[PDB]
Design a protein around this ligand. Structure first.
Ligand SMILES: Nc1ncnc2c1ncn2[C@@H]1O[C@H](COP(=O)(O)OP(=O)(O)O)[C@@H](O)[C@H]1O
Ligand SMILES: Nc1ncnc2c1ncn2[C@@H]1O[C@H](COP(=O)(O)OP(=O)(O)O)[C@@H](O)[C@H]1O
Ligand SMILES: [Mg+2]
Ligand SMILES: [Mg+2]
Lengths: 74, 160, 118, 371, 371
């Protein structure tokens, strides 16, 4: 538990997210556009992940603050 | 603040009825129109309203910088109608928490007199001698060098 | 103890702190954009061959997989942080109820209303 | 909607809507049928005057309390009292309001079950909940620990609580209360010549007790002083003249609380049943209970009791512990204020005994999870 | 990154980051569910208070240690203790920190395997390593030889080491420790009238043992002196008053260490199992072990034990050898200081059980080369 279930969800996310990979079958412009779209999408994913890192760090600091508060209650 | 015109044009009849009743009770003849705040406090107390009496007395000792001693309509009427709780929205708890976090460069869970002093330097506010002790009373409700976001919120909640 | 001056100082502190937070968040956005541009390097494909596209797609699959795994982990962290935030908010609310809720009531809700009619 | 916080009590019924500071209507709980014949025709004479109306016509009635010692002995009269309370003193039909009754600890089950059956069948309330009279008095003090001595008019009970966890094995319920003090005062007044016998004159003796009696700090010294000087003799005017002078009956009536041997009861006073109730608790929460002793109920309003009790407990308790006795000025309505606070809570809103639940399990639902 | 040097122990959990002098958070390892009913609503009452929180609410809890004698008997409670230690006392998520647990010698395998399985599956650490509690205590002394007697609170074990080569055939593990001394003290206190029964009062008896008891240099002379004079009777104030006076119970409680026949155990005392552990070693390293006898663990903090043990061993040992007993003032945290030193070493950095290794061989990896 808590080691394969999450692993399974991550695997499913990878499966649904990684689309069909096929390049040399098509015209160069179409594949170039698709690759640029995927690059921009993953770059936006990086931006979102970084914003999540900052936000969760701030909320961890707030959790420390609440820990100090509950310590002040005793 | 100068919300005096805003106050007089903002009041609801729920309290304007009592205001006019007190206007009748106070002004009964031989009135200069200034309406002394001293009798105003007693009349409002008799009216059954429940403001804080001592704060208005200290204000009367302090407000009216011109030193008339009998405050004109604006300030004394504002203090009278302070029974109506028309505050400055009280801001937001999340906004103040974000502010305290921004000040929490030390990241210790509290902002001390030094960080507040630096903030005052940044805004350029006048040097006041109420400092330190104001943090000690408001922020240091436990007297331990620790002030959380609740003391910050209650320090200037609904300031107008 | 001045009051009007205190009110002005507090509200000006609020406004200045809000402006400082806004400018600081703008700085943070600029830094984040700089980091994104660095780590996710800008990609130009003007007059480039098709093997470049194949390499780009390969690196795209690799980086998409790694970033999705990393963001899966970061999302687990965020969910745990949200759960902790909710629990600690509940605990602080319980503490505030223990300290203050019994003092919260409608005193003289009708007692002062009826005076002498009886 | 709003909840009705009724509090049956024994001697004064206190009721009012949840969320206020004081009960809306407080009136004695007596139902008195007329006893003489009645010759005027068409005077509009009723067959039973209840509540505060029978404290004004008490000259020709035979008042009889429907609640003896916490328990209810006359269900028809209690139903009449409740009907009066709902319809005439509050004027709110019970079909649209939850109710929160209160009950003394260690009372017979049948009393509680009959109470809930009446509230659900006759008055047809949406949902009712029964609470122990001491936990509310602990709510009103704003504490969460402490041992509360709720000396009402029917029964005196002493419930210790720590951190919100009640200790069911340490509840000491004693049946000496204000009514027995009234009877004992009426019995010792006969030593000067004043004889009160009628059930109407019990009210006069109760008024004497309320207005004149006080608890002595030291009993023997007061007995010696009252027997030499005359600085204690306070006079009082009966409802018809003929003032009376109460001598050392002043502090001998409420002394029965600390020496129940006066009225022939075996048990120890309210000063020693509190210490016994503490000593039954665990060894690690005795300091907190010592420091947070709470007084409540009407009978604890005697002038000078919060000092006598503290002196007695300090004599009994170990010398190191600090003994503090919380005696708020709003002692009489402490239980009802606590009831209002409890009914106003959001966390409590799902503990009511909903009517459909009663329809499925019968009146015995009250002993179940919905306590 | 930095390593987490946790040390489960039995009685006090000691934890902290590697490379410091003292553990960051030290708190009793007890998990106590409430046992009474609880009447206050919305008080925020939890279902289990662990760690140092349950030493303040112990008046209404039933504390129960999750580790009996080194071995772990209640895995859910131990998991709860670990979760508390990681998240609230250190506030570092375990996903980014190696861990270094400690385990007594000669413990059941299943305990160690379950420990590693929990650390890898539930908390999901990067890498964990399990070390014998005596080698660390030898690290902390800065030695490389010596025979260490680590008398903890759960189990007393005596591991001899020479030149870094442990002697597996000379480990003498004895199950008398601080807990049995607490129980025996609680049992002999009844000879004066003081009865402690509740699992909460075991903590009070433990405090008495810590603050008052001492080890006598000569037992019979002390028994004779305490029976004639009264210079030994030291008093102590309970958590509620009622001071108690401990007579010759002072040095009779810790005497059980040197005469385990008091609590009915057959084996020989800690003064003779050390000599037996030495005599099992080879004939050429006995002088070094005699000269470098090391004491560790909490229970070896009794005032006057480093002299009694030296006298006993000098009586047993040959007259020519020099007997020296190393008793550092930081005895209690000696194991954890040694753990920090070991985790801070560069040579040790490749001995951790990496997670991929566990994925390939299962929990039975701990018995393999990565010990
Ligand atoms: N001011 C007072 N001084 C002395 N005794 C009082 C006072 N007020 C009430 N009592 C006694 O307390 C009784 C009322 O107690 P109360 O708290 O109303 O009982 P219940 O718990 O049934 O409501 C009266 O019968 C009276 O004897
Ligand atoms: N100062 C002291 N004097 C006497 N005994 C002590 C002292 N401190 C701790 N102890 C005993 O040692 C025990 C703690 O031992 P400890 O070394 O923490 O065990 P562990 O090896 O499980 O960490 C306590 O239960 C207590 O009985
Ligand atoms: Mg009552
Ligand atoms: Mg140990």
């Amino acid at each position: 538990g808590k080691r394969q279930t999450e692993r399974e969800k991550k695997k499913k996310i990878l499966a649904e997210r990684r689309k069909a990979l096929a390049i040399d079958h098509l015209n160069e412009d179409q594949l170039r556009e698709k690759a640029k779209e995927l690059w921009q999408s993953i770059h936006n994913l990086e931006a979102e992940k970084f914003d999540l890192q900052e936000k969760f760090k701030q909320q961890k600091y707030e959790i420390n603050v609440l820990r100090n508060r509950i310590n002040d209650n005793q | 603040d100068d919300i005096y015109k805003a106050a007089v044009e903002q009041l609801t009849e729920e309290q304007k009825n009592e205001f006019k009743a007190a206007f009748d009770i106070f002004v009964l003849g031989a009135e200069d129109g200034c309406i002394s705040t001293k009798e105003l406090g007693k009349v409002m107390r008799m009216l059954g309203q429940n403001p804080t009496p001592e704060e208005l007395q200290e204000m009367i000792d302090e407000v009216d910088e011109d030193g008339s001693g009998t405050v004109d309509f604006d300030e004394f009427l504002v203090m009278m109608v302070r029974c109506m709780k028309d505050d400055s929205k009280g801001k937001s708890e999340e906004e103040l928490s974000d502010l305290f976090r921004m000040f929490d460069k030390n990241a210790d869970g509290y902002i001390d007199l030094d960080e507040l002093k630096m903030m005052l330097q940044a805004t350029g506010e006048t040097i006041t001698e109420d400092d330190i002790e104001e943090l000690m009373k408001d922020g240091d409700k436990n007297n331990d060098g620790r002030i959380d976001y609740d003391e910050f919120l209650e320090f200037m909640k609904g300031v107008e | 103890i001045s009051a009007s001056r205190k009110l002005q100082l507090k509200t000006l502190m609020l406004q200045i702190a809000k402006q400082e937070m806004e400018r600081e968040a703008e700085e943070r956005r600029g830094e984040k954009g700089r980091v994104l541009r660095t780590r996710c390097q800008p990609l130009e494909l003007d007059g480039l061959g098709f093997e470049e596209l194949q390499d780009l797609c390969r690196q795209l699959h690799a980086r998409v997989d790694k970033v999705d795994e990393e963001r899966y982990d970061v999302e687990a962290k965020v969910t745990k942080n949200i759960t902790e935030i909710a629990d600690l908010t509940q605990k602080i609310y319980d503490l505030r109820g223990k300290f203050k809720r019994p003092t919260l009531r409608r005193v003289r809700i009708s007692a002062d209303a009826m005076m002498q009619a009886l | 909607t709003t909840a009705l916080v009724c509090d049956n009590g024994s001697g004064l019924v206190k009721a009012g809507f949840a969320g206020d500071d004081a009960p809306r209507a407080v009136f004695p709980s007596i139902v008195g049928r007329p006893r003489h014949q009645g010759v005027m025709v068409g005077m509009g004479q009723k067959d039973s005057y209840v509540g505060d109306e029978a404290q004004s016509k008490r000259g020709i009635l035979t008042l009889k309390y429907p609640i003896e010692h916490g328990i209810i002995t006359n269900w028809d009269d209690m139903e009449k009292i409740w009907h009066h309370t709902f319809y005439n003193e509050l004027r709110v039909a019970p079909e649209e309001h939850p109710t929160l009754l209160t009950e003394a600890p260690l009372n017979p089950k049948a009393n509680r079950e009959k109470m809930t059956q009446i509230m659900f069948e006759t008055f047809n309330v949406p949902a009712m909940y029964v609470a122990i009279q001491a936990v509310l008095s602990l709510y009103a003090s704003g504490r969460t620990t402490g041992i509360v001595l709720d000396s009402g008019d029917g029964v005196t009970h002493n419930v210790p609580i720590y951190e919100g966890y009640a200790l069911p094995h340490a509840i000491m319920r004693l049946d000496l209360a204000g009514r027995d003090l009234t009877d004992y005062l009426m019995k010792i007044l006969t030593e000067r010549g004043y004889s009160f016998v009628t059930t109407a004159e019990r009210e006069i003796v109760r008024d004497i007790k309320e207005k004149l009696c006080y608890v002595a700090l030291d009993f023997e010294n007061e007995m010696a002083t009252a027997a030499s000087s005359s600085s204690l003799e306070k006079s009082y005017e009966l409802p018809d003249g003929q003032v009376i002078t109460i001598g050392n009956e002043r502090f001998r009536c409420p002394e029965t609380l600390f020496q129940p041997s006066f009225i022939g009861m075996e048990s120890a006073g309210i000063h020693e049943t509190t210490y016994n109730s503490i000593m039954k608790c665990d060894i690690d929460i005795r300091k907190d209970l010592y420091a947070n002793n709470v007084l409540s109920g009407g009978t604890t309003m005697y002038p000078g009791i919060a000092d006598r009790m503290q002196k007695e407990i300090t004599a009994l308790a170990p010398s190191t512990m600090k003994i503090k006795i919380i005696a708020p000025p709003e002692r009489k309505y402490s239980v009802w204020i606590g009831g209002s606070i409890l009914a106003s809570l959001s966390t409590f809103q799902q503990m009511w005994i909903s009517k459909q639940e009663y329809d499925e399990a019968g009146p015995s639902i009250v002993h179940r999870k919905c306590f």
